[PDB]
Amino acid sequence: STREENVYMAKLAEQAERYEEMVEFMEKVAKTVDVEELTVEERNLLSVAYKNVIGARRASWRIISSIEQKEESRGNEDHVSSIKEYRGKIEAELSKICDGILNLLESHLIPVASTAESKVFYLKMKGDYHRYLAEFKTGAERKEAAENTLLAYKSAQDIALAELAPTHPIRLGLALNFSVFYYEILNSSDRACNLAKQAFDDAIAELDYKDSTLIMQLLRDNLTLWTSD
Amino acid sequence: STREENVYMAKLAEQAERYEEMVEFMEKVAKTVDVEELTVEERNLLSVAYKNVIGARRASWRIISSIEQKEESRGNEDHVSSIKEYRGKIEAELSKICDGILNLLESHLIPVASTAESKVFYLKMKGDYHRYLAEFKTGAERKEAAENTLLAYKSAQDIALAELAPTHPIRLGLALNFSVFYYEILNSSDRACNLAKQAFDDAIAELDYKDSTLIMQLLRDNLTLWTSD
Amino acid sequence: RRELHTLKGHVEAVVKLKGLDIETIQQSYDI
Amino acid sequence: RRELHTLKGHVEAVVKLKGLDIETIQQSYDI
Ligand SMILES: O=C(O)c1ccc(N2C(=O)c3[nH]nc(-c4ccccc4)c3[C@H]2c2ccc([N+](=O)[O-])cc2)cc1
Ligand SMILES: O=C(O)c1ccc(N2C(=O)c3[nH]nc(-c4ccccc4)c3[C@H]2c2ccc([N+](=O)[O-])cc2)cc1
């Protein structure tokens, strides 16, 4: 009956910066609760948790991959192959974490979403980890990602633009991640730049804090970077 | 015959910041080599490796333990016990890493030490990880640590003061760690402050770089902190 | 705060701190 | 460089960045 201990044991895991265990202290939260209306606290802990775990992998990935490019530039197959197989371990890890959150998000989190902002957050979250898959995948899984991502982000956008105010953090955060999805994954800078400014402008006319302020700055930084070379 | 691939696979593990695997990419280096004269490169990689792995645990430890104190200050046994058992996992991890490096240091590294500075480094290293044990242990193991530490550090000091110049990095680094050992573990601020200034002064008259310069600053910072409250 | 909240910031913080002379990876800001 | 090379520095960097109001742990500089 007391699932509040896992909320407490995850705050410790965060504080001690042991993120893979915080995920486990939060996997229990969703399951022991059964199918209940999940709170603002536990959601952010789950968000922070999986994001930090994945973040640590993607950081490792993007470094390893960039070392591999400076090695293909010299054509050292005996060096590149060992780099790639090590990347194979990281890519395998990444797959499992995404294949852990998504169906858990599918099973107990998306169906039990009540308010307007709750549905946007979880759908944006679904679109996120699907996009995280698209970063490294190649085959039929890669196409399925970009598809599942596009559908999830647009599904979230419809609720976000209508049900929530232009200055609401997640409405911009979704727009920010949606904006990267086009540029990074779909290789089309055009539709990316358009959505980026559009979400920015509507938030500006509204302005008239803290979390919202920061995201707008990321949008502006991306535009100035997407119009450089 | 080619153990150079593990030297290359550890530099990647460091670069990607996956430290527990770098240890494994270096455990192989010492063993596949058999009993050879270990280089400056591989030693520093082994040093950096185990130090970073342990560092990540001690950081977790000292945070968790400091949360436990603010909880005993309120007397919440249901909160403290869960903190302590989580600390039990970290303490168990710490034990194994030390019980991994030390006998490996004992088996293939201390006996095969040729030059003056090589023996100091490895003996200082032995004294280090023994001191790292003393941080959390309580029973007969705790006394054995402080003893094994004192013997290892003094054994290193004799070679350091005589065979190496006062401005040599490890001679000061040893002195720095030796200095903390007294204050932190043995609770006697007196013999700590004396060794700290003594190693500082002799390095000053010698002065007449980079790594050596930094360590002296740590010594001075410790004195000013050991004479405060 | 950029190296504290985004992947791009943390990546560029790590790559500069390690003295790795490899060419800068293309990346965008995301949460 | 103190939060980059010592345990004391990294601990004090993490504890301040997380907004944890617990009392400062006693520690000394070591490599
Ligand atoms: O991926 C991360 O490292 C991460 C995770 C959670 C956050 N969040 C916060 O710090 C925070 N403060 N308030 C909220 C919040 C909670 C419920 C509804 C709305 C805001 C959050 C979350 C947070 C902020 C922004 C976004 N976003 O629009 O991309 C998601 C989550 C920020 C970054
Ligand atoms: O615990 C750590 O994070 C760590 C590990 C290795 C180093 N080292 C270096 O960066 C470095 N550069 N040159 C040396 C070196 C190598 C062989 C002989 C002498 C110096 C190192 C090591 C290093 C520097 C200082 C000390 N020390 O006196 O405590 C030990 C190892 C510093 C910190």
Side-chain angles (χ1 to χ4, degrees), chain A residues 1-2 4-69 71-208 210-229, chain B residues 1-2 4-69 71-208 210-229, chain C, chain D:
Chain A
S1 62
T2 59
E4 273 69 47
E5 198 179 325
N6 302 78
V7 188
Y8 185 74
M9 281 285 277
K11 286 185 177 183
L12 289 158
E14 186 195 34
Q15 229 83 46
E17 292 188 325
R18 291 164 67 89
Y19 300 116
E20 37 273 327
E21 287 164 8
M22 175 161 61
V23 156
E24 292 167 15
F25 286 123
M26 210 51 60
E27 278 185 30
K28 291 179 179 181
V29 167
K31 293 166 190 176
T32 53
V33 139
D34 296 332
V35 206
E36 307 262 45
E37 195 70 35
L38 204 131
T39 59
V40 188
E41 255 210 340
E42 297 156 32
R43 182 205 309 159
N44 287 310
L45 285 162
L46 181 76
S47 179
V48 164
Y50 273 94
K51 292 280 172 67
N52 266 295
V53 173
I54 286 287
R57 324 293 162 175
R58 302 205 297 178
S60 305
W61 193 90
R62 291 189 188 184
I63 297 297
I64 287 301
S65 301
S66 193
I67 305 159
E68 198 182 330
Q69 193 179 357
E71 225 69 275
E72 269 186 288
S73 180
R74 292 176 178 93
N76 302 313
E77 285 191 332
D78 297 333
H79 287 68
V80 172
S81 51
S82 53
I83 299 164
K84 205 177 190 188
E85 200 175 359
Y86 189 59
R87 192 186 74 186
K89 198 172 185 177
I90 315 160
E91 286 192 33
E93 283 184 359
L94 278 150
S95 306
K96 298 290 281 179
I97 312 158
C98 300
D99 282 309
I101 180 72
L102 289 168
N103 54 37
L104 191 146
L105 203 68
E106 173 90 325
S107 59
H108 298 296
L109 291 164
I110 298 157
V112 196
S114 57
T115 61
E117 57 178 334
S118 58
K119 264 166 271 190
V120 181
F121 191 101
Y122 283 122
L123 265 57
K124 170 196 168 289
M125 202 175 177
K126 193 186 183 72
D128 271 317
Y129 297 106
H130 278 294
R131 171 176 67 91
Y132 290 42
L133 287 156
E135 282 173 301
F136 62 99
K137 293 285 182 181
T138 50
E141 310 176 64
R142 197 217 181 281
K143 296 182 189 291
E144 283 168 335
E147 176 186 333
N148 282 333
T149 313
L150 184 75
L151 287 167
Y153 274 151
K154 193 84 175 185
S155 186
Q157 182 179 100
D158 289 19
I159 319 160
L161 297 175
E163 289 272 55
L164 304 176
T167 191
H168 198 285
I170 57 161
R171 192 191 182 275
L172 294 108
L174 162 68
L176 179 69
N177 284 316
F178 210 158
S179 198
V180 178
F181 165 66
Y182 283 111
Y183 189 89
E184 219 84 54
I185 282 79
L186 290 179
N187 281 308
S188 60
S189 56
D190 211 304
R191 209 176 188 98
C193 289
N194 280 120
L195 216 161
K197 195 201 174 187
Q198 225 291 314
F200 191 83
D201 288 345
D202 292 348
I204 291 300
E206 178 74 28
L207 224 173
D208 291 352
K210 302 279 182 177
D211 291 300
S212 306
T213 313
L214 187 260
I215 305 160
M216 302 181 191
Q217 298 174 162
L218 279 332
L219 292 156
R220 191 71 159 169
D221 268 68
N222 279 337
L223 270 327
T224 53
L225 198 70
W226 296 341
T227 51
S228 303
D229 63 329
Chain B
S1 62
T2 59
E4 273 69 47
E5 198 179 325
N6 302 78
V7 188
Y8 185 74
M9 281 285 277
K11 286 185 177 183
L12 289 158
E14 186 195 34
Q15 229 83 46
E17 292 188 325
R18 291 164 67 89
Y19 300 116
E20 37 273 327
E21 287 164 8
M22 175 161 61
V23 156
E24 292 167 15
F25 286 123
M26 210 51 60
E27 278 185 30
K28 291 179 179 181
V29 167
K31 293 166 190 176
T32 53
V33 139
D34 296 332
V35 206
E36 307 262 45
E37 195 70 35
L38 204 131
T39 59
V40 188
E41 255 210 340
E42 297 156 32
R43 182 205 309 159
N44 287 310
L45 285 162
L46 181 76
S47 179
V48 164
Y50 273 94
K51 292 280 172 67
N52 266 295
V53 173
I54 286 287
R57 324 293 162 175
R58 302 205 297 178
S60 305
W61 193 90
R62 291 189 188 184
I63 297 297
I64 287 301
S65 301
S66 193
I67 305 159
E68 198 182 330
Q69 193 179 357
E71 225 69 275
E72 269 186 288
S73 180
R74 292 176 178 93
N76 302 313
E77 285 191 332
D78 297 333
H79 287 68
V80 172
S81 51
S82 53
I83 299 164
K84 205 177 190 188
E85 200 175 359
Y86 189 59
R87 192 186 74 186
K89 198 172 185 177
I90 315 160
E91 286 192 33
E93 283 184 359
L94 278 150
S95 306
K96 298 290 281 179
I97 312 158
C98 300
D99 282 309
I101 180 72
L102 289 168
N103 54 37
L104 191 146
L105 203 68
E106 173 90 325
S107 59
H108 298 296
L109 291 164
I110 298 157
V112 196
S114 57
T115 61
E117 57 178 334
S118 58
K119 264 166 271 190
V120 181
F121 191 101
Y122 283 122
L123 265 57
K124 170 196 168 289
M125 202 175 177
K126 193 186 183 72
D128 271 317
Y129 297 106
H130 278 294
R131 171 176 67 91
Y132 290 42
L133 287 156
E135 282 173 301
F136 62 99
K137 293 285 182 181
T138 50
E141 310 176 64
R142 197 217 181 281
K143 296 182 189 291
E144 283 168 335
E147 176 186 333
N148 282 333
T149 313
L150 184 75
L151 287 167
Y153 274 151
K154 193 84 175 185
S155 186
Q157 182 179 100
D158 289 19
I159 319 160
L161 297 175
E163 289 272 55
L164 304 176
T167 191
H168 198 285
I170 57 161
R171 192 191 182 275
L172 294 108
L174 162 68
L176 179 69
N177 284 316
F178 210 158
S179 198
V180 178
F181 165 66
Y182 283 111
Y183 189 89
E184 219 84 54
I185 282 79
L186 290 179
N187 281 308
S188 60
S189 56
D190 211 304
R191 209 176 188 98
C193 289
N194 280 120
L195 216 161
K197 195 201 174 187
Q198 225 291 314
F200 191 83
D201 288 345
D202 292 348
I204 291 300
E206 178 74 28
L207 224 173
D208 291 352
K210 302 279 182 177
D211 291 300
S212 306
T213 313
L214 187 260
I215 305 160
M216 302 181 191
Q217 298 174 162
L218 279 332
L219 292 156
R220 191 71 159 169
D221 268 68
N222 279 337
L223 270 327
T224 53
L225 198 70
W226 296 341
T227 51
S228 303
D229 63 329
Chain C
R1 201 178 286 102
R2 309 210 152 166
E3 54 285 324
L4 305 171
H5 277 272
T6 67
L7 182 71
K8 185 175 176 292
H10 174 246
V11 164
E12 285 183 353
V14 167
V15 78
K16 195 168 79 181
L17 214 144
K18 296 283 268 290
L20 200 60
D21 64 319
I22 59 161
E23 294 296 78
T24 315
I25 186 161
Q26 62 94 30
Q27 45 185 21
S28 300
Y29 293 101
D30 68 316
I31 315 162
Chain D
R1 201 178 286 102
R2 309 210 152 166
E3 54 285 324
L4 305 171
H5 277 272
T6 67
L7 182 71
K8 185 175 176 292
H10 174 246
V11 164
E12 285 183 353
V14 167
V15 78
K16 195 168 79 181
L17 214 144
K18 296 283 268 290
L20 200 60
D21 64 319
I22 59 161
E23 294 296 78
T24 315
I25 186 161
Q26 62 94 30
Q27 45 185 21
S28 300
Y29 293 101
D30 68 316
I31 315 162

